[PDB]
Amino acid sequence: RPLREQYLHFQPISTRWHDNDIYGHVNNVTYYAFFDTAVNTYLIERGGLDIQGGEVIGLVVSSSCDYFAPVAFPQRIEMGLRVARLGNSSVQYELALFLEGQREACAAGRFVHVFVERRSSRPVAIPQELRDALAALQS
Amino acid sequence: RPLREQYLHFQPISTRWHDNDIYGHVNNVTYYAFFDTAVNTYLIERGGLDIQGGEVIGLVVSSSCDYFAPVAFPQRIEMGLRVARLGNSSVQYELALFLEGQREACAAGRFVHVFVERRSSRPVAIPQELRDALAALQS
Amino acid sequence: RPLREQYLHFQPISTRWHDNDIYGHVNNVTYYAFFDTAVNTYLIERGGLDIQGGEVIGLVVSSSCDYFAPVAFPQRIEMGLRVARLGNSSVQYELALFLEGQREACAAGRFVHVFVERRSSRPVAIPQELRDALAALQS
Amino acid sequence: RPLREQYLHFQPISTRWHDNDIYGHVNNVTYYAFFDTAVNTYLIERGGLDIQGGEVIGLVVSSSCDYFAPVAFPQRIEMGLRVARLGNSSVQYELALFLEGQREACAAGRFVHVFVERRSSRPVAIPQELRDALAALQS
Numbered sequence: 001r002p003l004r005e006q007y008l009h010f011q012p013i014s015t016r017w018h019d020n021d022i023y024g025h026v027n028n029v030t031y032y033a034f035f036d037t038a039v040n041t042y043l044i045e046r047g048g049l050d051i052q053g054g055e056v057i058g059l060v061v062s063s064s065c066d067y068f069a070p071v072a073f074p075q076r077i078e079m080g081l082r083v084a085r086l087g088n089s090s091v092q093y094e095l096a097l098f099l100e101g102q103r104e105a106c107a108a109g110r111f112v113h114v115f116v117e118r119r120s121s122r123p124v125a126i127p128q129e130l131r132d133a134l135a136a137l138q139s
Numbered sequence: 140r141p142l143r144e145q146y147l148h149f150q151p152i153s154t155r156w157h158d159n160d161i162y163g164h165v166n167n168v169t170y171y172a173f174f175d176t177a178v179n180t181y182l183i184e185r186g187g188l189d190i191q192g193g194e195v196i197g198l199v200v201s202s203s204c205d206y207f208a209p210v211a212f213p214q215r216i217e218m219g220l221r222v223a224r225l226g227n228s229s230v231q232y233e234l235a236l237f238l239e240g241q242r243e244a245c246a247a248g249r250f251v252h253v254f255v256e257r258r259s260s261r262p263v264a265i266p267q268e269l270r271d272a273l274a275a276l277q278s
Numbered sequence: 279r280p281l282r283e284q285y286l287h288f289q290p291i292s293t294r295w296h297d298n299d300i301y302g303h304v305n306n307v308t309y310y311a312f313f314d315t316a317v318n319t320y321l322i323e324r325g326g327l328d329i330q331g332g333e334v335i336g337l338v339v340s341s342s343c344d345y346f347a348p349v350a351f352p353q354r355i356e357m358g359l360r361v362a363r364l365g366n367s368s369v370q371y372e373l374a375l376f377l378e379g380q381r382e383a384c385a386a387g388r389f390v391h392v393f394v395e396r397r398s399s400r401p402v403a404i405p406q407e408l409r410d411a412l413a414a415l416q417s
Numbered sequence: 418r419p420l421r422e423q424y425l426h427f428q429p430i431s432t433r434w435h436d437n438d439i440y441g442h443v444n445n446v447t448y449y450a451f452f453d454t455a456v457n458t459y460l461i462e463r464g465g466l467d468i469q470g471g472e473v474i475g476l477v478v479s480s481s482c483d484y485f486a487p488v489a490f491p492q493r494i495e496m497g498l499r500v501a502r503l504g505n506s507s508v509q510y511e512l513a514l515f516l517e518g519q520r521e522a523c524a525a526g527r528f529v530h531v532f533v534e535r536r537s538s539r540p541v542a543i544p545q546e547l548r549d550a551l552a553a554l555q556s
Contacts, residue, residue, distance in 0.1 A: 014153045017176040018307060020300040022468055023535075024191055027296050028477040029453065032446040037156040041213050051439055052163055052211075060445040064481030072191075074180050157446060159439040161329055162396075166435050167338040168314065171307040190300055199306040203342030292431045295454040302469050315434040319491050330441050330489075350469075352458050 001068055002096045002105040007080025008137045011038045012100075015073040025070035026077075031107050032063060035095045038079035039113070047133035056124055058113040061090075065109035076100045083137040089123035090114045091134055140207055141235045141244040146219025147276045150177045151239075154212040164209035165216075170246050171202060174234045177218035178252070186272035195263055197252040200229075204248035215239045222276040228262035229253045230273055279346055280374045280383040285358025286415045289316050290378075293351040303348035304355075309385055310341060313373045316357040317389070325411035334402055336391040343387035347377075354378040361415040367401035368392050369412055418485055419513045419522040424497025425554045428455050429517075432490040442487035443494075448524055449480060452512045455496040456528070464550035473541055475530040482526035486516075493517040500554040506540035507531050508551055 004010075013034055021027040043049045043058065051057070071077060080096045092112045096105035115126055126134065143149075152173055160166040182188045182197065190196070210216060219235045231251045235244035254265055265273065291312050299305040321327050321336065329335070349355055358374040369391045374383035393404055404412065430451050438444040460466050460475065468474070488494055497513040508530045513522035532543055543551065 012153070013155070014151070014176075016152070016172055017179050018172060018296075018299050018305050020190075021296050022298045022300065022302055023474055024300055028480065029296060029446065029449040032449060033155055033157060036446065037153075037212075040156050044213050051159075057440060059440075060484060062481070062483045063445065064479070066479045067477060073176075074183050157435075157438050157444050160435050161437045161439065161441055162335055163439055167341065168307065168310040168435060171310060175307065196301060198301075199345060201342070201344045202306065203340070205340045206338060290431065291433070292429065294430070294450055295457045296450060298468075311433055311435060315490070318434045322491055329437075351454070352461055 002108045003103055004080060004098060007082045007094070007096060008139070009042060009081045010078055011041055011081065012076065012078045013037060015075055015077055017073055019073045025072050028065070028067060031065050031067070031097060031109065034077070034079055034097060035063065035065070035109055035111055036060065038081055038095060039093055039111070042081060042137075043130060043133065046136070048127060048129035055118045056115055056127060057118050058115050059121070061112050061114050063109065063111035065107055067107045069104070069106045071097070071099055071106050080105070081137060082139060083134055084110065086134055086138065088125055091126070141247045142242055143219060143237060146221045146233070146235060147278070148181060148220045149217055150180055150220065151215065151217045152176060154214055154216055156212055158212045164211050167204070167206060170204050170206070170236060170248065173216070173218055173236060174202065174204070174248055174250055175199065177220055177234060178232055178250070181220060181276075182269060182272065185275070187266060187268035194257045195254055195266060196257050197254050198260070200251050200253050202248065202250035204246055206246045208243070208245045210236070210238055210245050219244070220276060221278060222273055223249065225273055225277065227264055230265070280386045281381050282358060282376055285360050285374055286417065287320060287359045288356055289319055289359070290354065290356045291315060293353060293355055295351055297351040303350050306343070306345060309343050309345070309375060309387065312355070312357055312375060313341065313387055313389055314338065316359055316373060317371055317391070320359060320415075321408065321411065324414070326405060326407035333396050334393050334405060335396050336393055337399070339390045339392050341387065341389035343385055345385040346382070347384050349375070349377055349384050355384070358383070359415060360417055361412055362388070364409075364412055364416065366403055369404070419525045420520050421497060421515055424499050424513055425556065426459060426498045427495055428458055428498070429493065429495045430454060432492060432494055434490055436490040442489050445482070445484060448482050448484070448514060448526065451494070451496055451514060452480065452526055452528055453477065455498055455512060456510055456530070459498060459554075460547065460550065463553070465544060465546035472535050473532050473544060474535050475532055476538070478529045478531050480526065480528035482524055484524040485521070486523050488514070488516055488523050494523070497522070498554060499556055500551055501527070503548075503551055503555065505542055508543070
């Protein structure tokens with residue numbers, strides 16, 4: 001079960017009222033909202049994009065998540081982030097959700113960005129800013 | 140257009156990727172998620188509830204919002220909160236969303252809680268903890 | 279309590295698992311999702327826009343809702359829609375959510391579109407297709 | 418690319434205005450909302466639970482999705498569902514989203530339920546109604 005140390009960058013995301021579903025914990029779907037929020041915050045601040053903005057955007061082609069221990073609004077949650085592999089027009093992220101002050105991830109997942117030209121949605125090489133920012137998150 | 144000073148308690152809520160809709164700003168529906176997140180965080184920390192928890196819960200019977208200037212993930216947003224009137228089993232909140240470092244609210248709204256017994260959903264007097272916490276937010 | 283026949287156009291919206299919150303009913307915030315889903319669907323089929331395409335878009339400047347009886351996934355909900363006032367760059371919608379087939383509205387709400395130039399977001403006259411479509415919904 | 422007939426049970430889900438994100442298609446995260454909406458609807462009609470009522474509930478322990486072609490509100494989407502493995506307190510669902518009427522799946526995904534006692538959240542044998550219903554969806 002993944003550990004804080006195995007991740008390079010960390011982001012706190014506040015939990016919301018309706019994050020809880022009928023069974024009292026954060027809905028399993030919400031984890032992915034946390035995933036792509038966490039990644040794109042990093043791409044925005046440390047990487048250029050430009051979501052309003054640029055002619056290059058990231059498209060999610062796959063994701064997946066595993067769930068180990070539940071969590072609940074209003075607990076304070078944070079995301080570890082790391083980059084696993086990094087092709088030319090694509091990249092693969094590893095994310096995990098940590099409850100504040102815990103060594104053990106509550107869930108952990110991966111997802112894959114393909115960067116494309118906005119209008120054409122055809123793949124492109126990753127612009128240097130982003131590619132360097134992305135690289136900085138590699139183990 | 141409502142001002143920071145006119146509100147008693149303030150809460151920062153991080154914005155999320157998909158808070159933006161097709162037109163590039165935070166969706167108008169999301170403001171209400173911010174409203175009830177903000178209120179219930181306060182009720183949870185400073186008031187008792189106990190959403191897992193208690194035999195008394197808050198039901199939203201009305202809300203409404205006005206929108207003045209747009210805002211966007213990943214901007215950092217915060218909620219002013221104040222209590223306007225406070226009956227016996229009910230209460231009326233005034234909320235506004237502020238972009239960090241701005242005097243002017245970007246939107247502002249109200250909503251009404253009726254507190255009820257969990258099982259019976261029949262109104263109750265507000266328990267002393269909550270009532271005192273609520274009162275503390277009165278002008 | 280608003281009734282089915284006080285409304286001119288109806289859409290079915292399917293409820294979703296996470297529509298329900300911790301307390302077991304559709305969250306109050308989801309009601310507004312139903313509202314602008316329901317309006318915008320009408321605008322799209324019977325009115326022109328062109329949400330990717332158009333040079334003119336609708337901004338929500340205000341909204342409000344009242345809640346009468348709760349509802350839950352997986353019930354079958356549907357939306358009554360009517361138009362109340364119709365200025366020249368502005369319009370006012372009246373909405374009610376009905377559970378199938380009950381005559382009484384579960385909740386009822388209002389909201390306001392202002393149409394603007396996409397780029398400049400400055401108000402404009404409502405294009406004839408839209409205004410014709412809108413007026414169609416006037417009582 | 419998974420095809421309609423590789424799936425045993427189908428549900429229509431209506432798309433919603435905010436389904437689309439800043440880039441104009443249904444957000445990748447919404448796909449999972451469709452998944453557990455679609456499973457849970459089946460469990461509710463054809464299988465017993467009893468999400469308010471029941472002493473046994475389904476936990477999502479994992480999920481994954483692949484995206485092939487994008488989609489947008491207000492298109493008409495529908496979900497193929499089939500069951501892959503079926504242990505005794507566990508089950509594995511296979512899901513695909515289809516745009517009406519195309520033979521190719523827009524995206525395809527998997528997810529895992531583990532059934533537990535509501536209070537103790539310790540695994541249990543799947544109640545005969547559910548397991549009968551589940552097995553019905555086995556290829």
